[PDB]
């Protein structure tokens, strides 16, 4: 990723599109109002239009945690399949 | 010449001649395929102790 993101709460998802986890936001003039729930629990948290402006800030930047290599593990994946 | 008119096929001659072949054993079906299966879910379960889906799949941590 870049180190300045430009998404968030402008064209947003406004609602889920499965069966098994139900979202619905009431997207304000200011702030959001996101309420989740997956089976047996719920979640309702407030977030604001410069609320996932912030989340952006570190990145997550996930890497394959490999037995030998990710080579390696393509290579002994093709011959499993 | 009492000797040949007693049949010259021998006994052993009849019994090399109706067990032929050693016959296959129904539990030999049984212990390898279990045996082989075993690998099967050795490498292939999600519960067994040297799954191949870490060293296939590797993680995303």
Same mark, same amino acid.
């Given at each position: ?5 430009? %998404?968030?709460?402008?064209? &947003?998802?406004?609602?889920?599109? %499965?069966?098994? /986890?139900?979202?619905?936001? @009431?997207?304000? @003039?200011?702030?959001? *109002? $996101?309420?989740?729930? @997956? ?7 407030? $977030? %604001?239009?410069? &609320? ?5 800030? %570190?990145? /997550?930047?996930?890497? *394959?945690?490999?037995? /030998?290599? $990710?080579?390696?593990?393509? /290579? ?6 | 010449?009492? !000797?040949?008119?007693?049949? #010259? ?5 009849? +019994? ?8 296959? #054993?129904? !539990?030999?079906? +049984?212990?390898?395929?279990?045996? #082989? ?5 050795? #490498? +292939?379960? +999600? ?15």
């Amino acid at each position: 990723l870049t180190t300045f993101t430009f %998404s968030g709460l402008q064209d &947003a998802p406004v609602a889920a599109l %499965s069966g098994s /986890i139900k979202l619905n936001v @009431a997207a304000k @003039a200011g702030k959001a *109002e $996101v309420t989740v729930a @997956a089976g047996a629990a719920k979640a309702a948290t407030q $977030v %604001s239009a410069a &609320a996932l402006r912030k989340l952006s800030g %570190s990145k /997550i930047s996930l890497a *394959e945690v490999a037995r /030998i290599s $990710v080579l390696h593990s393509s /290579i002994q994946n093709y011959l499993l399949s | 010449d009492r !000797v040949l008119s007693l049949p #010259a096929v021998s006994k052993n001659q009849v +019994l090399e001649n109706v067990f032929h072949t050693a016959p296959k #054993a129904p !539990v030999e079906h +049984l212990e390898k395929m279990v045996s #082989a299966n075993s690998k099967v879910y050795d #490498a +292939l379960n +999600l519960q067994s102790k040297r799954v191949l889906i870490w060293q296939v799949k590797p993680a995303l941590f």
